[PDB]
Amino acid sequence: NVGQFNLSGALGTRGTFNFSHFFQQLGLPGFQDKPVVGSFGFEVNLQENQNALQFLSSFLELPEFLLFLQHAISVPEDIAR
């Protein structure tokens, strides 16, 4: 839902980040159901950011990730804090 901006029931607009300015730069209506500048003067590519969100969503479904987590828990803090 973050990738598709289906956020009306999860996000309000009172916060200090300016969503109207963000969506105006992107040419988008807002919450559904030139260099673009986002937070802190970072240049934002929406398609790359949406691909990154899709990557994490599938990354969290891999059965290999649970095995990675199990093995990574055992790595000593002396070599990886």
């Binding site: 290999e64 095995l67 828990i73 055992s74």
Partner: protein, 74 residues
């Protein structure tokens, strides 16, 4: 090899003698988990160097498990 098998009997993992310790094995190279995906499927070879290898009999077992099990399913 007796230390590999003892470790598995004691803790369920050939690499560790204890369930609540995760110190790396020193008697030989670590034994990887079997991950059932192409490119993975690692095994321990019981030779003198005890190496880790991937995809045992991949071609031959594809013949039996894919082609032959489909001939018998028709």
């Amino acid at each position: 090899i007796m230390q590999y098998f003892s470790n598995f009997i004691r803790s369920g993992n050939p690499n560790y003698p204890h369930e609540f310790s995760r110190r790396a094995p020193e008697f030989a190279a670590p034994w990887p988990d079997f991950v059932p995906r192409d490119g993975a499927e690692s095994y321990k070879e019981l030779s003198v160097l005890l190496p880790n290898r991937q995809g045992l009999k991949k071609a031959d077992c594809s013949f039996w498990s894919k082609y032959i099990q489909s001939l018998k399913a028709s």
